[PDB]
Amino acid sequence: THVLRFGGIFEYVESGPMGAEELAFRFAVNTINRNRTLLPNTTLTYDTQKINLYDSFEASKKACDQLSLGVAAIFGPSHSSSANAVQSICNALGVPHIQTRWKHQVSDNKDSFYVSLYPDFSSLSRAILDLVQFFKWKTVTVVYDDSTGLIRLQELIKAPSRYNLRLKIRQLPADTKDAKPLLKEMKRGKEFHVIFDCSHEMAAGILKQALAMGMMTEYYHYIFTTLDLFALDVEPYRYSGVNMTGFRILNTENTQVSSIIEKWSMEKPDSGLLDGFMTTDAALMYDAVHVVSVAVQQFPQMTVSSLQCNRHKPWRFGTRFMSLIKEAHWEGLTGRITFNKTNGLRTDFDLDVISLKEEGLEKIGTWDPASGLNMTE
Amino acid sequence: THVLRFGGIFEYVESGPMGAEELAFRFAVNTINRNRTLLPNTTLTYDTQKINLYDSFEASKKACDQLSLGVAAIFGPSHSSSANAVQSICNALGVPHIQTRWKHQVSDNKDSFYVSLYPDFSSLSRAILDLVQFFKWKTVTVVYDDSTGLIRLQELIKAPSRYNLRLKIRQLPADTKDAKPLLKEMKRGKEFHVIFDCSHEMAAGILKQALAMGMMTEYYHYIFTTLDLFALDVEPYRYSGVNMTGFRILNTENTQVSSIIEKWSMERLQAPPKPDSGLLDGFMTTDAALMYDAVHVVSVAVQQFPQMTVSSLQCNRHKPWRFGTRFMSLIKEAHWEGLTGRITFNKTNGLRTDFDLDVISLKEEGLEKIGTWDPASGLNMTE
Ligand SMILES: *C1O[C@H](CO)[C@@H](O)[C@H](O)[C@H]1NC(C)=O
Ligand SMILES: *[C@@H]1O[C@H](CO)[C@@H](O)[C@H](O)[C@H]1NC(C)=O
Ligand SMILES: *[C@@H]1O[C@H](CO)[C@@H](O)[C@H](O)[C@H]1NC(C)=O
Ligand SMILES: *[C@@H]1O[C@H](CO)[C@@H](O)[C@H](O)[C@H]1NC(C)=O
Ligand SMILES: *[C@H]1O[C@H](CO)[C@@H](O)[C@H](O)[C@H]1NC(C)=O
Ligand SMILES: *[C@H]1O[C@H](CO)[C@@H](O)[C@H](O)[C@H]1NC(C)=O
Ligand SMILES: *[C@H]1O[C@H](CO)[C@@H](O)[C@H](O)[C@H]1NC(C)=O
Numbered sequence: 143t144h145v146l147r148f149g150g151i152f153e154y155v156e157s158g159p160m161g162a163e164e165l166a167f168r169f170a171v172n173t174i175n176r177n178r179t180l181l182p183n184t185t186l187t188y189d190t191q192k193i194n195l196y197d198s199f200e201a202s203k204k205a206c207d208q209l210s211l212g213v214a215a216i217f218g219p220s221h222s223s224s225a226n227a228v229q230s231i232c233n234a235l236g237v238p239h240i241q242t243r244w245k246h247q248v249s250d251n252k253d254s255f256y257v258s259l260y261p262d263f264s265s266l267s268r269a270i271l272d273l274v275q276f277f278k279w280k281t282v283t284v285v286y287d288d289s290t291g292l293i294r295l296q297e298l299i300k301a302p303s304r305y306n307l308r309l310k311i312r313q314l315p316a317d318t319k320d321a322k323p324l325l326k327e328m329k330r331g332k333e334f335h336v337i338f339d340c341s342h343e344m345a346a347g348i349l350k351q352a353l354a355m356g357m358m359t360e361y362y363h364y365i366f367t368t369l370d371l372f373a374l375d376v377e378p379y380r381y382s383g384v385n386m387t388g389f390r391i392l393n394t395e396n397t398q399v400s401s402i403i404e405k406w407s408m409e410k411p412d413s414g415l416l417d418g419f420m421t422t423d424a425a426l427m428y429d430a431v432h433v434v435s436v437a438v439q440q441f442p443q444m445t446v447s448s449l450q451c452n453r454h455k456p457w458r459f460g461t462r463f464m465s466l467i468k469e470a471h472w473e474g475l476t477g478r479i480t481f482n483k484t485n486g487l488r489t490d491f492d493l494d495v496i497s498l499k500e501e502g503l504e505k506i507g508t509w510d511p512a513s514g515l516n517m518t519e
Numbered sequence: 520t521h522v523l524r525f526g527g528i529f530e531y532v533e534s535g536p537m538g539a540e541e542l543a544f545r546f547a548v549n550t551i552n553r554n555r556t557l558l559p560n561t562t563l564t565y566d567t568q569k570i571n572l573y574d575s576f577e578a579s580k581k582a583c584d585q586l587s588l589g590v591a592a593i594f595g596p597s598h599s600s601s602a603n604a605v606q607s608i609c610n611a612l613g614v615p616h617i618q619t620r621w622k623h624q625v626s627d628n629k630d631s632f633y634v635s636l637y638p639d640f641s642s643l644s645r646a647i648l649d650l651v652q653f654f655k656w657k658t659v660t661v662v663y664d665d666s667t668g669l670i671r672l673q674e675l676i677k678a679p680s681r682y683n684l685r686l687k688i689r690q691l692p693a694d695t696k697d698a699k700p701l702l703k704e705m706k707r708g709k710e711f712h713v714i715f716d717c718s719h720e721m722a723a724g725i726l727k728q729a730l731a732m733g734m735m736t737e738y739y740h741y742i743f744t745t746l747d748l749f750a751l752d753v754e755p756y757r758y759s760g761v762n763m764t765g766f767r768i769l770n771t772e773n774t775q776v777s778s779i780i781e782k783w784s785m786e787r788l789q790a791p792p793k794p795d796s797g798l799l800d801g802f803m804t805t806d807a808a809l810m811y812d813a814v815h816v817v818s819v820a821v822q823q824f825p826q827m828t829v830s831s832l833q834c835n836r837h838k839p840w841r842f843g844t845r846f847m848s849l850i851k852e853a854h855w856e857g858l859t860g861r862i863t864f865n866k867t868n869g870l871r872t873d874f875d876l877d878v879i880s881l882k883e884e885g886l887e888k889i890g891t892w893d894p895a896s897g898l899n900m901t902e
C-alpha cells in the first residue's frame with residue numbers, strides 16, 4: 143500500500159552496539175507498523191546514519207544524503223552543534239526536524255521547521271522551585287555539572303530576590319571520584335539541603351561518594367534534577383533514612399506503558415544504574431516517532447521528494463506537514479504530548495513526583511505548569 | 520611576488536552598509552600590504568562572503584565555496600551556530616579557522632584547527648571577582664541579559680561559598696525600556712552595588728533608565744562586564760557622582776594604537792551614526808579591533824612559512840590541506856602586539872587565556888584608567 147520514509151541520525155563514540163536512541167527509533171517504527179489503528183493503510187520505512195559526536199560537518203553531509211533519498215522528517219541528532227546544523231538544513235529545505243533533547247534556544251533565530259519533545263527547561267526550572275518551596279526550605283545548595291546546568295536552574299537562581307532563599311552554588315568536578323573535597327566543604331558547611339543538577343550517571347556516582355562521607359542519613363535531603371532518577375540503583379540507600387526527591391516524566395503507572403517498557407528491556411556492575419531500564423532520552427525518541435505519525439495519518443496526499451542541498455528548492459508538503467506536527471496531540475510513554483503554538487517547544491507536560499521511601503522510589507504527587515504541585519498527603 | 524588568499528565570512532541583518540567586523544578585516548589586509556616590515560615579499564588577497572545571522576547552512580555553503588577558491592584560513596563568522604559549523608568544516612579540511620568572539624567550548628569536542636582572539640571567559644570572570652574584592656563589597660546584585668551571561672560570571676556566582684559575598688541574581692528583560700520595574704525592586708532593595716552583564720548597547724540603555732530612576736548618584740556603584748564600556752557616551756553622567764567601573768582591553772594609551780583607531784574613525788565615522796544611541800559615534804569596538812588583530816597575528820605566522828600556498832579543496836572529498844597542520848601550529852605559537860595588547864594563545868586549547876586589561880572608572884573628567892589586571896598579578900591599582 144502507501145509508503146513513507148523517515149530519516150534517522152544517531153550520535154556515538156567508538157563503534158557498536160546500537161545506542162538507546164537509535165534502538166527506540168527502530169522499535170517505534172516496527173511497533174507502529176503492526177498497529178492497525180495507527181497508520182492502517184500506511185507503512186513506515188527508514189534510513190539510519192551514524193555519526194561521530196560533535197562532528198557537525200558529518201551530520202550535515204548525512205542529513206543532505208537523507209534529503210536526497212527522500213524523507214518526510216529527520217529525527218536529527220541529539221547534541222547541540224550537530225542538531226543546530228541539521229535544523230538549519232531542514233529549515234532551508236522545509237523538512238521537519240524532530241528533536242528529543244534540549245539545546246539552547248537563541249531568540250533571534252528564525253528556524254521554524256522543528257519541534258522538540260524534551261520538556262522545556264523553563265517549566266522544569268519552575269517545578270524544581272515549586273518543590274523546594276513545598277518542603278519550606280530557606281537554605282539550599284545547588285550543585286551543577288557543566289555550564290548548561292546553570293541555565294536549567296535560572297528560575298531557581300533568581301528566586302533569592304523575590305522569596306526568602308539564601309542559596310550557595312557549587313560545581314562538581316569532571317570526575318565524581320574527585321568529589322570528596324567538595325562534599326567535605328558542604329559537610330562542614332552544614333549544607334543539608336542540596337539540589338544536584340547533573341546526569342543520572344553523575345548522580346549515581348555522587349551518591350556513592352556521599353555515602354562514603356557519612357552524608358546519606360536522615361539529616362540530608364537531596365533533590366535531583368535528572369528525569370532518569372528512577373533508573374538509579376537505590377538498594378544501597380533506602381534503608382539509611384536519607385531523603386531523595388526528584389521528578390519522573392516516564393508514565394510508569396499506566397499499565398499499557400509498563401508493558402511496552404518491558405518488551406524493550408527484553409531486546410554494567412559498578413554503574414549504580416539498573417540494567418535494562420528505558421531512559422528518558424529513548425522514551426522521547428519513541429514518542430517522537432508516534433506523534434509525528436499521528437500527523438502523517440492526517441496527510442494521506444503527502445509523499446517524499448528527492449531534495450538536493452545544492453538547490454534552494456524546498457519540499458512542497460513541508461509547510462503543511464510541519465503545521466500538522468505542531469498541532470498534534472498524543473498519549474505516549476512520557477504522558478501528554480502537546481507542543482507550544484508559539485515556539486514548537488514542549489512547555490506543557492505532566493510529571494510524577496518521586497521520593498525515596500524504605501520500599502524504594504515511589505510516587506508522592508504530581509506537577510504540571512497550571513496547577514503547581516498536587517501532593518497526595 | 521608571492522601571494523596568499525584569506526577567506527572572510529561576515530554575518531548581517533537586512534543589507535548594507537558593511538559592518539564593523541568586515542570593515543576591520545579589509546582594513547587590516549590593506550594596512551599589512553603597505554607595511555614593508557610585515558610580509559615584505561608577500562601580498563595578501565581575500566574573498567568575502569556575507570551571510571544571514573543564524574543560518575549555519577548558508578555559512579557551510581560559503582565556507583565550502585571559499586575552500587574551493589583556495590584559502591589559507593577562514594576568518595569564519597561570529598555567532599555560535601554558524602561559527603561551530605564553519606569550525607567543523609575547517610577541521611575536516613585542515614584549514615585554520617580564526618574566531619574573534621566567544622562561544623561555549625564543549626569539552627568532548629575534538630576540533631583542533633581553530634584559535635580564538637577573544638579574551639576567555641574564565642579569566643574575565645576572575646578579574647570581575649578580583650575587582651569586587653578590591654572594593655571590599657560584601658553585597659552585590661548581578662544583573663545579566665541572556666543565559667550565556669550566567670556562564671561568563673560563573674566564577675563570580677560560585678564565590679558566595681568560599682568568600683563572604685551574599686549576592687542576588689536578576690535578569691534584564693528583552694528591552695531596556697521595560698527595565699524600570701526591575702530597577703525599582705533594586706532601589707527598594709537598597710541594592711547599591713551592581714554588576715551589569717550585558718552588551719554595551721544594553722548598558723547605554725540601562726543607564727538612561729537608571730538616571731530616570733534616581734539611581735545615578737554617589738550612593739550607587741556599577742561594575743560593567745562589557746569591554747566596550749569606553750564606547751559609552753558618558754556626558755550625561757560624569758557630573759552626578761555615580762561610580763562606574765569596568766575593563767578595557769583596547770590599548771588606547773599606546774600612541775601607535777591611538778593613531779590607528781583614528782584612521783579607522785575617518786573611513787567609518789563617515790557613515791551612519793545615531794543620536795539617541797548613547798554611544799560615541801565612530802569609536803572602534805572590541806569585536807572589530809579583534810578581527811583586525813587576528814589578521815595580523817595570523818600574518819606573523821605566514822611570514823614563517825614561505826613554502827605555503829593555497830589549494831583548491833572540495834568538501835566532497837576527505838582530502839585535507841597539506842600545509843594545514845604546520846600552519847595551525849605556527850598560528851598557535853604566534854605572539855603579537857596589536858590593538859588589544861599582548862596576543863598569545865594557550866598551548867593547550869588555543870584560547871586566549873592570558874592578556875592585559877586596563878581598569879577604567881568614571882571620574883568627573885570622563886572615563887579614565889585607574890589600574891591594570893592580568894591573570895598572574897591580579898590587580899595593579901595605582902593609588
Ligand atoms: C495500537 O495498539 C495498542 C494496543 O495493541 C493501543 O493501545 C494503541 O493505542 C494503538 N494505537 C493507536 C494510535 O490507537
Ligand atoms: C509557550 O506557550 C505557553 C502556553 O502553553 C506560554 O504560556 C509560554 O509563554 C510559552 N513558553 C515559552 C517558553 O515562551
Ligand atoms: C492538579 O489538581 C487539579 C485539580 O485539583 C487538576 O486539574 C490537575 O490536572 C492536577 N494535576 C495533575 C497532573 O493531575
Ligand atoms: C567614585 O566616584 C567619585 C565621584 O565621581 C570619584 O571621586 C571616585 O574616583 C570614584 N571611585 C572610584 C572607584 O574610582
Ligand atoms: C484505510 O483506512 C480504512 C481502513 O482502516 C479504509 O476504510 C480507508 O478507505 C483506507 N484509507 C484510504 C485513504 O483509502
Ligand atoms: C524524608 O521524607 C520522605 C517523604 O518524602 C519520607 O518518606 C522519609 O521517611 C524521610 N526520610 C527520613 C527517613 O528521614
Ligand atoms: C609596520 O609599520 C607600522 C608603522 O608604520 C608599525 O607600527 C608596525 O609595527 C610595522 N610592522 C612590524 C611588525 O614591524
Ligand SMILES: *[C@H]1O[C@H](CO)[C@@H](O)[C@H](O)[C@H]1NC(C)=O
Nearest residue numbers: 641865866867868870872873
Ligand atoms: C590554558 O589552559 C587552561 C585552561 O584555560 C589554564 O588552566 C592554563 O593555565 C592555560 N595555560 C596557560 C599557559 O596560561
Ligand SMILES: [Ca+2]
Nearest residue numbers: 174175177181
Ligand atoms: Ca500501522
Ligand SMILES: [Ca+2]
Nearest residue numbers: 551552554558
Ligand atoms: Ca606587506
